[PDB]
Write a protein that binds this ligand. Structure first.
Ligand code: K
Lengths: 253, 249
């Protein structure tokens, strides 16, 4: 199976070659966003924690983290990296979320897995249900220009000893989604170079600003600010990763 | 096996800008027709699986193909058949004489580190070339090794064939390293892949080095082109095509 070290080196490659934001900078921007808007944040809910790179940052910085993810195998890599300092649960969005969080975060472009705009709105509604008025929800999504391949084709691979992995991001010109073709080779026995191949395919969807703003406004986030990859500069046509900062409306409005 | 090597060449052509083999022979024929020396017998070094050998044979040349690997010669002798004389030679080593020209496409001169190693190969070719004959070969440039490849990864999963090109490059160097991994499936057709690996360092050579060794080897004239076209080589050239002309001595 793909260890946490291989996933980390995939993130390192996305930072160097694909313009992805390093995880310490994500947590820095997220902490600074909370303080700059007058938010006393102690408890944080993290949607789709993955292997726990963002979870590890939030725990080192002294937050009471609750991390959820649909994949049980990804949670095992997250509990090993962080430990018992964070609460881990298995939740596939959209689904009812736990209460008690001062802020909600969802990094690593996990929201691109939402199959449709309705599913995106249903997930945003589940977040607004557990957020008090004024609390923030910060997430990032890859843009259509990135998913279409305007900055080149994204592909990476790692040749470990008994394991080998290939991530091929393909984009058809007639669709608005990107298909991630994941290939895994596993050495049968220690000596012979015979391998077993396993292939999985996942789909990443794009959402324009009108859809994100309409679904967020319908879920109870009338205020939606979009930034360029965890910085203070605005989102432009050259933006590959958009950082959205939503603020929960007043329930009396 | 021959289909595996052909699909690897297809990837290099499509993804890295390598010249298709029919267009290589077009440039080679066009160059030969403008040097004032009748070319009929062609000594092809580094023939590999016979992709360039097939083009020279199809165009009516008497080809003598050689390669350092025996498994590569069997695939080349299977593709072309018997219309070429195949031999196993690993330069620097004595080469056969009697050819009107020498060609070596997709050359492995980037595996060589020192300029002396480049000079030994050029001297071996000049020994079996008469006055005025030409030596045509290609070389990968720093713009390809450092600029394009660099520290990027190229890989593909084509079902029965999967491969990985993992490049490593430092800014203070004139070379790059590549880690190659390959998985192939044959008669099983289900889930039985054979994995093989190889690692090579790829060196870059400046034009002054190539010409200095060429003049010392017996090639007074050394012309460089951009990837088997008549356009000259620039800073964006990824594959230089060199045309060396043997001295009158
Ligand atoms: K690399």
């Amino acid at each position: 199976a793909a260890t946490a070290d291989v996933y980390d080196r995939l993130v390192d490659y996305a930072i160097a070659e694909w313009g992805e934001c390093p995880r310490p900078q994500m947590a820095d921007f997220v902490e600074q966003a909370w303080a700059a808007r007058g938010h006393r944040v102690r408890r944080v809910l993290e949607l789709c924690c993955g292997t726990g790179l963002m979870t590890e940052q939030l725990v080192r910085r002294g937050y009471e983290v609750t991390a959820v993810d649909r994949s049980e195998t990804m949670l095992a890599l997250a509990k090993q990296r962080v430990g018992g300092a964070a609460d881990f649960h298995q939740i596939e969005l959209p689904a009812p979320l736990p209460d008690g969080a001062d802020a909600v975060v969802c990094t690593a472009a996990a929201f691109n897995y939402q199959a449709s705009a309705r599913s995106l709105g249903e997930t945003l509604r589940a977040v607004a249900t557990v957020l008090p008025a004024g609390a923030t929800f910060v997430f990032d999504i890859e843009t259509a220009a990135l998913l279409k391949g305007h900055w080149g084709n994204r592909v990476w691979a790692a040749d470990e000893g008994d394991l080998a992995f290939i991530w091929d991001f393909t984009s058809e010109p007639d669709t608005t989604y990107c298909d991630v073709h994941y290939t895994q080779f596993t050495r049968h026995e220690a000596g012979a170079d015979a391998y077993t191949g396993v292939r999985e395919v996942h789909r990443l969807y794009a959402f324009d600003h009108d859809t994100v703003r309409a679904q967020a406004r319908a879920a109870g986030f009338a205020q939606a600010e979009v930034f360029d990859n965890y910085t203070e500069r605005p989102a432009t046509d050259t933006t590959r990763y958009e950082t959205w900062v939503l603020t929960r409306d007043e329930r009396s409005r």
